[PDB]
């Protein structure tokens, strides 16, 4: 649909449990560049202090230049429009040394920027070998199973 660039590599590195559909506030040059205009999403995380959940890693540069006078930087900590129900609970289960909130995908909800955000947990590399083994383990298991019927 109206989906924008998504952090598919985050699923390999993190094993996110719960998701959100919080909206993102953005400037006037951001909206034009959001539909097309080369928005990137890699290494997207958050920098909460009180209620200041910011989409950190989001490289979106103005394709057609619409910047005059004051500065306009392509990478900014864009303010997220978060529900108060979803806000107080992030004083808890994100401060656990490995817990973070990342953005899996970017899209639209009837000409409004709503970003699918999720609370990542992060994989160490010792269990990264197991998951790649497990994905091959599921495929090869039915290969043995099908040989009974050949």
């Amino acid at each position: 649909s109206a989906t924008i660039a998504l952090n598919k590599r985050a699923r390999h590195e993190y094993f996110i449990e719960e998701e959100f559909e919080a909206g993102l506030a953005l400037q006037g040059w951001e909206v034009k560049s959001l539909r097309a205009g080369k928005a990137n999403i890699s290494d997207s995380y958050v920098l909460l202090r009180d209620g200041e959940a910011f989409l950190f890693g989001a490289n979106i540069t103005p394709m057609a230049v619409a910047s005059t006078h004051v500065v306009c930087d392509p990478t900014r900590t864009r303010k997220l429009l978060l529900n108060q129900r979803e806000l107080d609970s992030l004083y808890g289960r994100v401060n656990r040394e490995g817990y973070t909130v990342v953005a899996l995908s970017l899209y639209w909800k009837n000409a409004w920027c709503k970003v699918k955000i999720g609370v990542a947990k992060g994989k160490k590399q010792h269990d990264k070998r197991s998951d790649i083994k497990e994905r091959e383990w599921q495929v090869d298991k039915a290969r043995i199973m099908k040989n009974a019927h050949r």
Binding site: Q84, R85, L87, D88, S89
Partner: protein
């Protein structure tokens, strides 16, 4: 039928029939029904007219819903507008009798909508 506060029950036990009004529970209404001279399990249709009207004076002895609904606010006015310790907990949804506010005392705050 209707007794002094509103007290309009539907064919229940006469003690539990008196519990439908604020300000008097089951054990207090039995003492109210003690002077009524009626059985506990008789229905409202089985409550005679000569005894329904005598129930209005019995429930008017103890202070009831017609004046007890502001008695809580007066005790609140002794705390909330008087700046007492219980009133500070009363205003912002905190327990006033010393519950463990760190994790528990959820229903004193209200629903966990956030």
């Amino acid at each position: 039928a209707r007794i002094a506060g509103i007290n309009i029950p539907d064919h229940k036990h006469a003690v539990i029939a008196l519990t439908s009004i604020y300000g008097v529970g089951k054990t207090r209404s039995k003492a109210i029904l003690a002077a009524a001279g009626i059985a506990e399990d008789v229905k409202i249709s089985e409550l005679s007219e000569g005894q329904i009207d005598t129930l209005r004076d019995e429930v008017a002895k103890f202070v009831v819903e017609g004046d007890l609904r502001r008695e809580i606010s007066m005790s609140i006015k002794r705390l909330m507008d008087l700046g007492c310790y219980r009133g500070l907990r009363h205003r912002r949804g905190l327990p006033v009798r010393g519950q463990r506010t760190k994790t528990n005392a959820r229903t004193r705050k209200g629903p966990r909508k956030p």
